[PDB]
Point group: C3
Chain length 126, copies 3
Amino acid sequence: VVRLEVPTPEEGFVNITRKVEAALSGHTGLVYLFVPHTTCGLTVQEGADPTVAQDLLGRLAELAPRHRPQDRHLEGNSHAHLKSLLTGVHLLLLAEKGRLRLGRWQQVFLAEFDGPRVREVWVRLL
Amino acid sequence: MEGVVRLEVPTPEEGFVNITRKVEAALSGHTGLVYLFVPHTTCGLTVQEGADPTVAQDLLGRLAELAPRHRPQDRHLEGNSHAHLKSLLTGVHLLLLAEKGRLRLGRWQQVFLAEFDGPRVREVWVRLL
Amino acid sequence: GVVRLEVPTPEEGFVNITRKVEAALSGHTGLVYLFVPHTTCGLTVQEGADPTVAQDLLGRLAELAPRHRPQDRHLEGNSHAHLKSLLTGVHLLLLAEKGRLRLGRWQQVFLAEFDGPRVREVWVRLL
């Protein structure tokens, strides 16, 4: 497995498409991605129009508000745990000659919900 | 594409399209894991129940409440942010077991292309491992 | 070609199946596929050692997917569970090294039950 280091903001979708492809070495086949974290996730979504990620983050904040009196996990990041579960922490994608095989408007994002930090993303070719 | 089958699936404005048989038809009797992917950002892939039509009905109804089309705060002018969210929540890929061309699923499971912004003709890629 | 785990579950909760999966690996190294042949439970990787994380996850999911929704047409009444299942997902792909699942120090593998109590199956396959 190849380990990528990805600095992240307090909250946001970090495009890691190029960093991943940089670890493919001309690979044509499947690519496994995994984040060994519980308060961030991985997703494939549109990046071309920056307002898409804006609305995704905004809407997720409404489904998973930071403020919840009933929360028992007082450290305060239960909202991030929920966002991570909803998004997912692993991906499996296809690549062609070192490039991720994605749709017209797709980019690979490390969705940070509890940063800022330097997150790790594991990459494995198969 | 080489080694990857491209299925093209017609979809309604919104709904769960059962693509179980169409995926199986692309397996050529394969035995092993099967990878599925939609190269789209406003639809998804999920494994759910089709036997009772109301399951899909309630899923779409509830997803609309979680991701309403109408949101003044949206910055994405095109107006489909709701579909982008439903897609993110559902997921855009699946990995399933197949035996001699048939998907191995639970008694109440079917493979669905979850359309949130149609009607369209979506693509679904199939890769045999 | 797959190993089946029989996992007991409560009415609802995150059942840690990390050790059960590893026992079935018998020292295997490589990618491992997990799948639940069910539509009202799911599979996810989350923090386990702290009981409050799972509690808040279940609490918030119940708020996002209420059990009693007037508009529901699925009379059986478990559409909330079907939704939670769809939102969580029903399969996982994880790396294993010498029989141990490669995970972050605070991650555990969970069968997320939303409509128990019952016994769920988890299919395991070595790639």
